[PDB]
């Protein structure tokens, strides 16, 4: 309740504490990469970049609220997790 989004919590007043085939959607069949064609120019530590495991792996599509009234999964308040993988954060 007192963390980030406390303003929303206080405003609420809560106080505890075949066209669906996979290929159709592959972006080779849905994109104009013909513009990308350029006519005339004018490891003890992994070298490759590490991507957000939640974006790469998690199903963020369970948080999409398709219908406000009939929402299939009961959602819960989210705690701040302060991922330390990201640089630019002191801790």
């Amino acid at each position: 309740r007192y963390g980030p989004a406390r303003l929303w919590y206080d405003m609420l007043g809560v106080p505890e504490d075949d066209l669906l085939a996979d290929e159709n959607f592959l972006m080779v069949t849905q994109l104009h990469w013909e513009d990308d064609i350029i006519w005339d120019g004018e490891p003890w530590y992994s070298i490759f970049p590490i991507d957000n495991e939640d974006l790469v792996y998690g199903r963020w599509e369970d948080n999409i609220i398709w219908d406000a009234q009939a929402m299939p999964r009961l959602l819960e308040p989210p705690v701040l997790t302060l991922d330390p993988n990201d640089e630019n954060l002191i801790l």
Partner: protein, 404 residues
């Protein structure tokens, strides 16, 4: 067996007027002997470890029941043809039932296959099955990359070998790309390295960097294990760009080494044309871009030559339906370059290459749909571009057909 069939056999032998109970008596006796042998030929199949029931199983099942695996002929003498089989009769239902006796002599005999050899590999290493080609295969925690450090080191070695400092290193790295089974789950990083490379490698037209990347694309395509059409959309621009883009280096010389690039590049694009095909997405999209590259006014003689080559290997019908109504424009472009008179620009070289390629395609397009009559001056109705030399190319094609 059908009793009607037994009657046909009986009256075609001289035994006429057989009763139905006489005829039913034949078809339960012989249907038992077929069932007795096929149950007995399944013993040789189960002792073969083959679960196949080959044609030789019935030859041993017959010999086991003291009947000659003699098929189509029965020797009441037995001495010359004992229980050794003759391999059956190669006969069909849809056969011709009459052949010429010199047709069987003049056909080439099939190749005797390789003899049996003993190779060893590893089903399991201390419990784990290896992925060799002989086998079927609050702070959030600090995450790990999805590649291992052996895999990441392998990627670094393969990419630093594929930029072609040494040729033997390239060739192995290309074969390693062409047959590594575990090269999936590293394929995003290879596709991104290719794509990103060509785009910052056409800023300065570095031909080797591009010829090596196109060979890397060709080595990525013929690998049978990996699934490519998730990266097919990223791949199409990079292979296509090298073939028709302008050359920031020297157009006149490494012209041919650039046409050799356009060749190994037409290979990856041709794979894209033949594979990965669904309705009206890939082949028609690159065909439309090639045609509006062609109908383009005052196009670069490098872009023009590359697009001409690209529309050229689209197969049999594509040049049959597309290159036809455009010969006059090609001739007019050639005439303008010839007028010049300045030869300083790469325009003359581009024109000569385009005309030669178009003339070769037109030659078989003609050899393919029409007889080779009036090969002297009838081509003057098509502006007289290749004419008698085109006729000579058609004659060489006819000689190759005769050799075949």
């Amino acid at each position: 067996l059908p009793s009607e069939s037994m009657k046909v056999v009986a009256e075609s032998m001289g035994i006429a007027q057989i009763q139905e109970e006489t005829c039913q008596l034949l078809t339960d006796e012989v249907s038992y002997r077929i069932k007795e042998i096929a149950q007995d030929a399944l013993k040789f199949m189960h002792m073969g470890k083959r679960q196949k029931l080959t044609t030789s199983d019935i030859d041993y099942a017959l010999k086991l029941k003291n009947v000659e695996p003699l098929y189509g002929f029965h020797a009441q003498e037995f001495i010359p043809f004992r229980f050794a089989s003759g391999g059956g009769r190669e006969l069909y239902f849809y056969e011709e039932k009459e052949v010429d006796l010199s047709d069987i002599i003049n056909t080439p005999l099939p190749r005797v296959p390789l003899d049996v050899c003993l190779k060893a590999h590893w089903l399991s290493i201390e419990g784990c099955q290896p992925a060799i080609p002989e086998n079927p295969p609050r702070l959030k925690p600090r995450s790990i990359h999805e590649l291992s450090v052996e895999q990441q080191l392998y990627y670094k070695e393969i990419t630093e070998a594929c930029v072609g400092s040494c040729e033997a290193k390239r060739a192995e790295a290309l074969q390693s790309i062409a047959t590594d089974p575990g090269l999936y789950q590293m394929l995003p990083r290879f596709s991104t390295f290719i794509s990103e490379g060509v785009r910052v490698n056409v800023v300065q037209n570095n031909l080797a960097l591009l010829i090596y990347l196109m060979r890397m694309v060709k080595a990525l395509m013929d690998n049978p294990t990996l699934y490519l059409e998730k990266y097919v959309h990223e791949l199409i621009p990079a292979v296509m760009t090298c073939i028709v883009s302008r050359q920031l280096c020297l157009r006149p010389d490494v012209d041919n080494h650039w046409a050799l690039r356009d060749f190994a590049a037409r290979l990856v694009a041709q794979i894209c044309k033949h594979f990965s095909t669904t309705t009206n997405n890939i082949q028609s999209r690159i065909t439309k871009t090639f045609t509006k590259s062609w109908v383009d006014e005052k196009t670069p003689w490098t872009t023009r030559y590359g697009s001409i080559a690209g529309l050229a290997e689209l197969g049999h019908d594509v040049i049959k339906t597309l290159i036809l109504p455009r010969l006059q424009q090609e001739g007019e472009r050639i005439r303008s370059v010839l007028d010049g008179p300045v030869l300083s620009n790469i325009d003359r070289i581009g024109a000569d290459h385009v005309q030669s390629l178009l003339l070769k395609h037109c030659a078989p397009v003609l050899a393919k749909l029409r007889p080779p009559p009036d090969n002297q001056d009838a081509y003057r109705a098509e502006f007289g571009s290749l004419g008698p030399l085109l006729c000579s190319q058609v004659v060489k094609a006819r000689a190759q057909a005769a050799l075949q």
